[PDB]
Design a protein around this ligand. Structure first.
Ligand SMILES: CC(=O)N[C@@H]1[C@@H](O)[C@H](O)[C@@H](CO)O[C@H]1O
Ligand SMILES: CC(=O)N[C@@H]1[C@@H](O)[C@H](O)[C@@H](CO)O[C@H]1O
Ligand SMILES: *[C@@H]1O[C@H](CO)[C@@H](O)[C@H](O)[C@H]1NC(C)=O
Lengths: 370, 50, 370
């Protein structure tokens, strides 16, 4: 009899979600969970605070799953703030709540659906050895995770039998005033035909425009960007160079209805296995105000068990940093009419591309030998 | 670990150094039996000698 | 035009002093005052910050420590709530080192330096007293790591590593094993960085192991002097004291003096837009605040009532004043003054541990080798 809340933002097929909620078989474990579908606008952090406070004070909610449709980044930090301050477990399955943060608080209670920076770098390195692109350079800005990104490649390519060649790393700052001239001047030093970028959408567009002023976005240059650069497939800034390669979370065939059921199953099985063995379950005084003394009962055991679950032949174990540790990834490409096309799929360190040779989009000759 | 006996070219050069430099010593063998190189451990940014 | 400012204080007298200060600064562009009290929980702080940000549409917020001793968790909601909309916040009496991370706190500045910055006082005492062999004893926290990192960066300049670094888990009741290892080393100068409650545990073990007699030198910080640490503390310990770190009234006056300098120079620029007063309404980032923080950080205050006020490229106070204290006969007497760059002792004499009156060698060369 654990109270689980479901939150949707903006327009969504709520009736479809309600219909697909009753699609799991949980009769082999005493859960009898409660489901509460609530919808609200994207007004502000204060509305979010009030919403979770009122819901928790309404009727004994023991867990929350949060969904979203916007591209906001600070919403993940806000939800982590509530997660740390009040011990209720919440999950971020879609939208801006799925964006990765700098780091989780030690006492925080938060898990997200999506790969980390290290896993994304490892994935995008495989794409470069499917096609023998051994010459590349790295350019990035000041973001919570920039060092780890470059450190991952530096650690991976230093001990390899493949011949990796790295040509300089740039750590340009976009917050400087009148530094655009210096940025443009230092962008001319790039010579490798493969460029790796680590930025956010706005400064990604700014950098793309600056580079197009130099002009190295036209024929013999290829750019690879992580998942958060594109962010949402529907809108294109139109200053993105044609032929851009990006990695993204699998959303085409991983419908929102399955995510809610998966999160509910994870929460229910974690609570059940923690309840049965320890003969205990936390049902705190469900009031959002006056939580200074609410820390009487520790709930870290639930946190300790939330990182190892499985159901319906699937692995959903989380990581210590709060990421999925085993996601499903896809590779998208930008074609002439601005749109993202699904090129390849990645799973369990194994890459599976739909092409055998990269299409070119003369002084390129064929050679035959024996 | 068990006590053992050691002698050779390097052992009696240490004895000459100790007498001239007026110090007292205790000796032991290296645990892993390696001269030493720099490696990386368990997916970390640090790099440490063995 | 009229531009108002806001602040977060917890004292009626402090509110009256702020009113007097703003009235005086009006005689120096019309600026008003808006302040509120403190709540016993953080979510109330966040909601009150957003509600009162909507009420006045201020450009900056001043925050000081409450009567609470720790003063660590209290500033966190204000920083997040302000940071979300990108509005600068001036911190007055915060010493925790977490607020020095730009990624976690995008908009936060310091009026006083962090606890971890008081390691250049230690570096200068090592240079004037020709000490080259020290033992660094720190706790495994974010506070200890920054203090360790600063000391190793400073020492690496001369290419003189610390002899050894020992880490103990926070909130422990057994440090005998750690202290035994430090007693079999060459150095006799010990630097300790921990909390007041935790430091007293180390002091009792040190006196039991006869590590507080003649030939030993202890260098500690402000936390290791305050609290119940003086109840269990051997004589001759050299501590530190901030010149005006406990005077919140002085910080309020000069903090207003420097923000009023920026507000004069902020409205004299093109493309300036008032930050939105739509707490509930707006989820966008104000274009004013990346440029505002740049000029605010470089706004070198000519002269104030607490000395020259400047900022490094981290939003931290520069050129602070420290008093080198000394514990003799259960009473502390001041011995020297460090004006940021040099140490000038007074006519008072120094009593070293064990009752001797002579600088110690701080070294005991061993004649047995491994
Ligand atoms: C107060 C305390 O806990 N003292 C113990 C001591 O009895 C023990 O011999 C030692 C083992 O290294 O650890 C410490
Ligand atoms: C509690 C305390 O120390 N208050 C003092 C205050 O009386 C004094 O006016 C001010 C200026 O130095 O410094 C502070
Ligand atoms: C600080 O101490 C130094 C010691 O050499 C002295 O020259 C200087 O006048 C003092 N005051 C200031 C403001 O630097």
């Amino acid at each position: 009899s654990i109270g689980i809340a479901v939150i949707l933002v903006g327009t969504s097929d709520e009736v479809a979600i309600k219909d697909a909620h009753e699609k799991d078989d949980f009769h082999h474990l005493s859960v009898v969970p409660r489901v509460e579908l609530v919808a609200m606008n994207e007004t502000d952090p204060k509305s979010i605070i009030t919403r979770i406070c009122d819901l928790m004070s309404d009727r004994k909610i023991q867990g929350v799953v949060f969904a979203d449709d916007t591209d906001q980044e600070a919403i993940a930090q806000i939800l982590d703030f509530i997660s740390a301050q009040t011990l209720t477990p919440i999950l971020g399955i879609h939208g801006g709540s799925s964006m990765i943060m700098a780091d989780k608080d030690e006492s925080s209670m938060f898990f997200q659906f999506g790969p980390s920076i290290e896993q994304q770098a490892s994935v995008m390195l495989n794409i470069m050895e499917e096609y023998d692109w051994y010459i590349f350079s790295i350019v990035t800005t000041y973001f919570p995770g920039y060092q780890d990104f470059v450190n991952k490649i530096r650690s991976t390519i230093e001990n390899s039998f493949v011949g990796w060649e790295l040509e300089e790393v740039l750590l340009l700052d976009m917050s400087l005033d009148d530094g655009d001239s210096k940025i443009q001047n230092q962008l001319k030093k790039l010579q490798s035909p493969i460029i790796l970028l680590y930025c956010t959408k706005e400064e990604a567009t700014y950098i793309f425009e600056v580079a197009n002023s130099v002009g190295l976005t036209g024929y013999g240059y290829t750019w690879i960007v992580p998942s958060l650069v594109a962010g949402d497939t529907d809108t294109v800034p139109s200053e993105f160079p044609t032929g851009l390669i990006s990695v993204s979370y699998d959303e085409w065939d991983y419908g929102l209805p399955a995510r809610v059921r998966d999160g509910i199953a994870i929460i229910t099985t974690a609570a059940s296995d923690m309840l049965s063995e320890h003969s205990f379950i936390p049902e705190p005084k469900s009031s959002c105000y006056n939580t200074h003394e609410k820390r009487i009962y520790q709930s870290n055991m639930l946190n300790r068990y939330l990182i190892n679950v499985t159901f319906e032949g699937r692995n959903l174990s989380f990581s210590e940093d709060g990421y999925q540790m085993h996601p499903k990834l896809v590779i998208i490409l930008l074609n002439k009419e601005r749109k993202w096309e699904r090129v390849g799929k990645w799973k369990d360190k194994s890459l599976q591309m739909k092409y055998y040779v990269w299409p070119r989009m003369d002084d390129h000759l064929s050679i035959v030998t024996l | 670990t068990v006590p053992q006996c050691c002698y050779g070219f390097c052992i009696d050069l240490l004895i000459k150094l100790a007498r001239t430099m007026q110090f007292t010593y205790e000796v032991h063998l290296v645990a892993d039996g390696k001269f030493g190189t720099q490696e990386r451990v368990q997916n970390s940014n640090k790099k440490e000698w063995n | 035009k009229i531009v108002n400012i806001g602040a977060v204080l917890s004292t009626r007298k402090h509110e009256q002093m702020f009113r007097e200060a703003v009235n005086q600064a009006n005689k120096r562009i019309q600026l008003q005052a808006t302040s509120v009290t403190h709540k016993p929980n953080a979510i109330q702080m966040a909601l009150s910050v957003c509600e009162d940000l909507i009420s006045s549409q201020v450009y900056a917020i001043l925050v000081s420590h409450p009567p609470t001793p720790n003063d660590h968790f209290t500033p966190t909601p204000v920083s997040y709530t302000a940071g979300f909309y990108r509005i600068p916040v001036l911190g007055l009496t915060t010493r925790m080192s977490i607020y020095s991370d730009k990624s976690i706190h995008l908009s936060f500045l310091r009026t006083v330096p962090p606890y971890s910055h008081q390691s250049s006082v230690w570096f200068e005492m090592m240079r004037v007293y020709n000490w080259n062999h020290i033992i660094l004893l720190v706790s495994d926290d974010h506070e200890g790591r920054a203090a360790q990192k600063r000391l190793e960066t400073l020492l690496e300049e001369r290419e003189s590593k610390a002899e050894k670094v020992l880490q103990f888990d926070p909130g422990t009741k057994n440090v005998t094993a750690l202290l035994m290892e430090a007693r079999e080393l060459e150095a006799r100068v010990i630097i300790l960085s921990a909390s007041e409650d935790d430091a007293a545990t180390v002091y009792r073990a040190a006196a039991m192991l006869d590590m507080t007699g003649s030939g030993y030198v202890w260098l500690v910080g402000e936390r290791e002097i305050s609290g119940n640490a003086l109840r269990y503390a051997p004589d001759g310990i050299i501590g530190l004291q901030l010149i005006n770190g406990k005077n919140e009234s002085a910080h309020i006056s000069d903090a207003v003096g420097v923000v009023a300098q920026a507000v004069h120079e902020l409205l004299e620029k093109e493309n300036i837009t008032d930050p939105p007063r739509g707490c509930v309404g707006n989820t966008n980032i104000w274009k004013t605040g990346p440029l505002f923080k740049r000029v605010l950080m470089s706004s070198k205050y000519a002269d104030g009532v607490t000395g020259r006020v400047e900022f490094n490229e981290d939003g931290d106070r520069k050129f602070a004043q420290y008093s080198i204290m000394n514990l003799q006969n259960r009473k502390l007497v001041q011995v020297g003054i460090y004006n940021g760059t040099h140490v000038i002792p007074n006519d008072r004499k120094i009593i070293w541990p064990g009752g001797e009156t002579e600088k110690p060698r701080g070294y005991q060369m061993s004649t047995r080798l491994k």
